[PDB]
Design brief:
The protein is α+β, with helices and mostly antiparallel strands. About 35% of the residues lie in helices and about 15% in strands. It is built from nine helices and seven strands. Strand 4 and strand 5 form a beta hairpin. This is Insulin receptor subunit beta.
């Protein structure tokens, strides 16, 4: 077994010289991710802020190929609520995969920065109900898109959601006992329905400002607790509407949980005016 390189140097190929790296953003599944700038990568803008993925130096040839193969797959995604591919540098080493930059980082980090005791509090109040409903809809929309494209996330969590410069939340990377559905923990079965369970946990993270799920329980205890039918307690003074969403996501029977499109449908009337203009839900592709 050995993967063939499916990436085709096409319109997505970007000359290395157009990419300038500024700083490290953190380790990605394949290697260090950097914040950078790209010259003339998007029609209409002289330079674009970007995130640049690289592959570990210790990576095998096979892994380097898998890295590029994932980039090729991303050429087919065009959702506003899923972090998008902008370009690829496959000529020579190191291989670079250029993505749109999410200036505010992962959702977990962002949430924890809004905590009152946060040493890096931006001086802004925690998410309002309105902002939470908006985040829920954006995340659900991105997930609905992946589901339409026939992809199961398997790792949805606040740490894997990203926040843009205008605070739009998007699905980040994807191919964690505290985020897994009981059926997944029991039979290793992953579906869009188990993704829904994880979505509920993300809502819980949003309403608790990223507290650790089931804090106090070992991974061992969580495994039994969840498979026994137990679920997370509602965070203090959690908005009733978000609590209702969580409860739907945590139905023991996966068949009883809502779909991501149904989540967006439930929230559609309470979103920013721009939502219908950018969502998968309101696009002609949602059929």
């Amino acid at each position: 077994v050995f993967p063939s390189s499916v990436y085709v140097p096409d319109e997505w190929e970007v000359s290395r010289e157009k990419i300038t790296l500024l700083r490290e953003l953190g380790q990605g599944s394949f290697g260090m991710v950097y914040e950078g700038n790209a010259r003339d990568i998007i029609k209409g803008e002289a330079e674009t802020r970007v995130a640049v993925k690289t592959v570990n130096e210790s990576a095998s040839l096979r892994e380097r190929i898998e890295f590029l193969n994932e980039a090729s797959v991303m050429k087919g995604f065009t959702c506003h609520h899923v972090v998008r591919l902008l370009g690829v540098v496959s000529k020579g080493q190191p291989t670079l995969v250029v993505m749109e930059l999410m200036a505010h980082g992962d959702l977990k980090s962002y949430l924890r920065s809004l905590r009152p005791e946060a040493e890096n509090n931006p001086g802004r109040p925690p998410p309002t109900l309105q902002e939470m409903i908006q985040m829920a809809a954006e995340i659900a929309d991105g997930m609905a898109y992946l589901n339409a494209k026939k992809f199961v996330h398997r790792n949805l969590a606040a740490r894997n959601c990203m926040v843009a410069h205008d605070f739009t939340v998007k699905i980040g990377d994807f191919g964690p006992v505290r985020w897994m559905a009981p059926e997944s923990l029991k039979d290793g079965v992953f579906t869009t329905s188990s993704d829904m369970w994880s979505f509920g946990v993300v809502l819980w993270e949003i309403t608790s400002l990223a507290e650790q799920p089931y804090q106090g329980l070992s991974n061992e205890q969580v495994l039994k607790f969840v498979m026994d039918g137990g679920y997370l307690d509602q965070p203090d003074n959690c908005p009733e509407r978000v609590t209702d969403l969580m409860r739907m996501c945590w139905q023991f029977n996966p068949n009883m949980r809502p779909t991501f499109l149904e989540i967006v449908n439930l929230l559609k009337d309470d979103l920013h005016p721009s939502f219908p203009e950018v969502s998968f839900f309101h696009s002609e592709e949602n059929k």
